[PDB]
Design a protein around this ligand. Structure first.
Ligand SMILES: Nc1ncnc2c1ncn2[C@@H]1O[C@H](COP(=O)(O)OP(=O)(O)O)[C@@H](O)[C@H]1O
Ligand SMILES: Nc1ncnc2c1ncn2[C@@H]1O[C@H](COP(=O)(O)OP(=O)(O)O)[C@@H](O)[C@H]1O
Ligand SMILES: Nc1ncnc2c1ncn2[C@@H]1O[C@H](COP(=O)(O)OP(=O)(O)O)[C@@H](O)[C@H]1O
Ligand SMILES: [Mg+2]
Ligand SMILES: [Mg+2]
Ligand SMILES: [Mg+2]
Lengths: 172, 370, 370, 370
């Protein structure tokens, strides 16, 4: 079967709607708790699993950690749509602009509004947005270290080929 | 926190990003004493700025370090910027990324010297220079329109449509509040009054700020002033004597519609706004006539938006609806726009950083800002 | 059901097999911004398609990826096909067979890249490429006739007798509505009005679509307009200024009957139709004359069916009834007849399938779509 | 003898037939005083013309009555023709037939009013209106060529082969000497030099005619000028103060190759020439590429012919010679061609006589001239 988040084995994790606000290694501002710099976190997992997971056409969600891994998986498919033909520097500015621009959260054009819960209060919506903006800025910045690993002025074709591999036939 | 400084020709307006109005608003002025000062030991100093220089205007000589939107004295400009950070905002500039304002069609060296002073002398984290017209459109909360800004030193038109400026249709007129102060100071001589000192310039500016208005039909205001006293109004000088002002009260602002009053050949603000719309592409003109955004203190006269609507209705074809958008916050709509722009989440990757000014030098501002 | 996509030179016309009319109809245009994008955010895009390009056009360079019925830009044609499926029809193309169309006597590579992009980009389950004039004959309720189809980029004549096409008698003429729009720009310049940009070319296309018509006798109409105000009438631009035109209303369409007005050395659409009938075998000509079928937007002029009948009656022998079939829905007859064909049960065996493309490559189209 | 009068958008060029160069060459300007004129006996007059307006330019406002090759002010144009005949040539129009000039793709009301004024106001015996670029090919000593003509108001391409013009392949661009002057006034502001009056437009035109040149490799000249060097050069204004300019010398005419510098959506003069050749019949293209003819003063920048030859060589296929003809007299080649055409012993049937103007009215000119 497909690969699920190792962070589904975590417990008492902070949550919004039914996203898990998992420990995150990042330098962007936002609510996410600093992870250990020495260990894999959900973004090292999400990019490491993405290019296997985007081929499967069946996925059963174990909890809020997988709902977070899925939102990341769908956003990596958006990034690999945005990145094509760019220099590494143009790609960093384009994919940060993509990460920052106004997006639908669950409970609002959201593609998976049946599998994700609406925000639990008018204040839960703001913590869900301020988490998802920080997460997807880090997710964009981290992906670029892989697609521009060997060369710096053109995205690796070994990553651009997943740009049409629409995970579970869903997209943001 | 980011700083926003609207670096005006007649007033400095300054504050933080996300504040709804400037924290500081003061004369863009530096001055030196013109008298012996023989009673030494009462805290005298060699030069003064802003409200202090304005309050002592009789014993001072007053200079503006900006002329027509161009910094003409860079030592006096850094003395004003030091005073914005340390006296008015009361912050360290090396902790605050700073947004700056400029007119379009300025000397390239003005923007470069404004850049190197910020990094070399105020040690700023990051900086940006915005063309002050698009800030007036951010304060107006719209994607489309022709901005008319008329400040102290310059008047300019900028067409924007759906977020895109038309830089060929942009045009500037080197006539605004300073030139109207010079012309009022001239025509009050026709009634036998005299104003020549740099203090008396500020007394005539302080008159212009409150007595003057724009005629809706200039020849009718002239003919009614030639047959009644009802258009005359009166003012008291700081010396205590009283003056009366008549057709001079609208003949001053009429210079914006007839620049030949000061010997200029150039088109009036209605004619230049229309010619800037006509220089734009045929499909956008409809939405420019629907969005003439007024900005800056020379747009604050009573009746000017009604006159501008009358005049642009005469120049445009009769089938279509023209409106002038002239908010109460006209004086600050540039700074308010800078407050909005500096607060946008997508703007935070557009700041020109010290850590890229380092290898590129002062020419970084032309490649990074606009 | 199956999609029918009549991706013509000027309009994309799209919908579902068995529907009464196309439910997606939009300009075959990609637009890209030609100006300084100064405001950050603002909902801006790298390019715009169809009605979004047509409504933003004052800031866009507009270009059609298809000219003379041939795809000149495949990257923008994929952008248009994406807009048909995902934005305009709101379908998964991997769920639906697609009937595509093209004009006869096209390059072989056009059919190949069109089948390749449908199977490899849009992942379609099945597709077919029909000749546009053969589709237009199903929309007539006929199985014999000669179809004169004229779109934006190409005019063609296809004679069919009892379901057999006569491919030696097929005529193509690379003159249709875009050449008439370019000629209307060239002659509007003589009355005082210059239209120059790709955006202004859409204004003069809209003038052509509601002011222009075909004269029954050109030299009498030309003399009637030269001697009276009665043929003259007016149009209002987006800018609210008014255009008046006279003989330009029938001089533009007369280029279909007199191609030398645009410098072409070819027979007009009437004589090209007669030359196609005269290339057919002698027994079939009587039934072709009684069944001249008009199609495409360039046949929508007032008076063109009356003119076409007058002109063919002078070429044919007087001993027989010439009949021109010009339905009011002939604006869409290629699409209408594609929706008939795509709903027939034998046609369900005629599709190129995914499995069959994967085994054979894009050359499969040349040995299955005729 | 016959008069020849090239009605340029920027200069009148006039003389008799068969003379080697124009007798009269002066600005196509009317000037009017813009000041009170208090001094009695100063010799002031209601309006000024040509070099009399140019030598008074400090006290006048200067109007060109031709915009883009179209007369926009007929009262000031007949004042220019009156000055031409009675002051500059010093002859009676009643005794001399007149050859006049007009750009192609031009409002036919211009040609009608122009012929009406010669028969009604000057009572000229006979006249003609030649196409501007067809005269330049007579001066070139040729009967095959594509003529790139660029004056003060209009740039156009006329392809002609064996004495036949291809009017469908004629192309017109409303970008020439004034558009480049106005762009030079725009970019001179980047140094802080301000030019805004109509007299200052003449000073910037007088700079353009000797400081500007065409870069062969524009982006390499932009890189070369960044290292300050002999690329930057000086000019002295009428007031005795001096200006220095660098890349402004070649950004100036680069607008001919990049019309997007002034916000136009059009091909440069190289792509416009190539599009006109590619619109001609396939057999004549080789002889047009070998006979590419330059005329009008806006073709007189140093390096323009060398850059045009480089650009057309990159657009066209490499197998055949591409030759550009740029005579040292190309400033006057239209008037020279008129001096030939009015002199040719086989042209005298082609003049419009007063006797047939009195039968038909001014619409006679459309039957004789094209
Ligand atoms: N109410 C007013 N009526 C007339 N002139 C005004 C008014 N308010 C301000 N001004 C004038 O406009 C200028 C100040 O406006 P401002 O927009 O701040 O100019 P700037 O930004 O260029 O310094 C000064 O010349 C001032 O005298
Ligand atoms: N009422 C009309 N009168 C004249 N021309 C028309 C009319 N309606 C459409 N056209 C022209 O027909 C062309 C579009 O026709 P269409 O059949 O859709 O062409 P295509 O299939 O090749 O894209 C355009 O040139 C358009 O201006
Ligand atoms: N030496 C020159 N170098 C560059 N440009 C020139 C020169 N002499 C004249 N011009 C150009 O020619 C224009 C003058 O008009 P002209 O060539 O006579 O055209 P027209 O016939 O339309 O009046 C000038 O404004 C300038 O653009
Ligand atoms: Mg200001
Ligand atoms: Mg078509
Ligand atoms: Mg000329």
């Amino acid at each position: 079967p497909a690969y699920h988040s190792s962070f589904l084995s975590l417990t008492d994790v902070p949550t919004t709607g039914n996203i898990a606000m998992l420990p995150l290694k990042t330098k962007f501002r936002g609510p996410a708790y600093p992870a250990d710099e020495s260990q894999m976190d959900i973004i090292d997992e999400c990019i490491g699993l993405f290019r296997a997971n985007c081929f499967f056409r069946n996925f059963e969600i174990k909890g809020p950690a997988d709902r977070t891994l899925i939102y990341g998986t769908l956003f990596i498919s958006e990034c690999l749509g945005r990145v094509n033909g760019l220099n590494y520097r143009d790609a960093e500015r384009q994919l940060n602009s993509l990460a920052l621009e106004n997006f639908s959260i669950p409970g609002s054009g959201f593609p998976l509004n049946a599998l994700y819960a609406p925000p639990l209060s008018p204040q839960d919506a703001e913590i869900m947005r301020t988490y998802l903006t920080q997460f997807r800025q880090e997710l964009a910045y981290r992906l670029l270290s892989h697609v521009y690993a060997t060369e710096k002025d053109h995205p690796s074709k070994w990553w651009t080929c997943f740009s049409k591999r629409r995970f579970m036939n869903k997209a943001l | 926190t980011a700083l926003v400084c609207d670096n005006g020709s007649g007033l400095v307006k300054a504050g933080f990003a996300g504040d709804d109005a400037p924290r500081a608003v003061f004369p863009s002025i530096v001055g030196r004493p013109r008298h012996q000062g023989v009673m030494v030991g009462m805290g005298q100093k060699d030069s003064y700025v802003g409200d202090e220089a304005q309050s002592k205007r009789g014993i001072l000589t007053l200079k503006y370090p900006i002329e027509h939107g161009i910094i003409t004295n860079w030592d006096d400009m850094e003395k004003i910027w030091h005073h914005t950070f340390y006296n008015e905002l009361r912050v360290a500039p090396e902790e605050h990324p700073t947004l700056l304002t400029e007119a379009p069609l300025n000397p390239k060296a003005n923007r470069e010297k404004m850049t190197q002073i910020m990094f070399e002398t105020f040690n700023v984290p990051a900086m940006y220079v915005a063309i002050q017209a698009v800030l007036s459109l951010y304060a107006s909360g719209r994607t489309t329109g022709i901005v008319l800004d008329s400040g102290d030193g310059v008047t300019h038109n900028v067409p924007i449509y759906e977020g895109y400026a038309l830089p060929h249709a942009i045009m500037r007129l080197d006539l605004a509040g300073r030139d109207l102060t010079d012309y009022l100071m001239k025509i009050l001589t026709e009634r036998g009054y005299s104003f020549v000192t740099t203090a008396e310039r500020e007394i005539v500016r302080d008159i212009k700020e409150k007595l003057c208005y724009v005629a809706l039909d200039f020849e009718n205001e002239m003919a009614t002033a030639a047959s009644s006293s009802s258009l005359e109004k009166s003012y008291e000088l700081p010396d205590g004597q009283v003056i009366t002002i008549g057709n001079e009260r609208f003949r001053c602002p009429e210079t914006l519609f007839q620049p030949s009053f000061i010997g200029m050949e150039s088109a009036g603000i209605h004619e230049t706004t229309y010619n800037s719309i006509m220089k734009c592409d045929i499909d956008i003109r409809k939405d420019l006539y629907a969005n003439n955004v007024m900005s800056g203190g020379t747009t604050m006269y009573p009746g000017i938006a009604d006159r501008m609507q009358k005049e642009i209705t005469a120049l445009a074809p009769s089938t279509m609806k023209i409106k002038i958008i002239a908010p109460p916050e006209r004086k600050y709509s540039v700074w308010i726009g800078g407050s909005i722009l500096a607060s946008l989440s997508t703007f935070q990757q557009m700041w020109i950083t010290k850590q890229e000014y380092d290898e590129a030098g002062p020419s970084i501002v032309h490649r990074k800002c606009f």
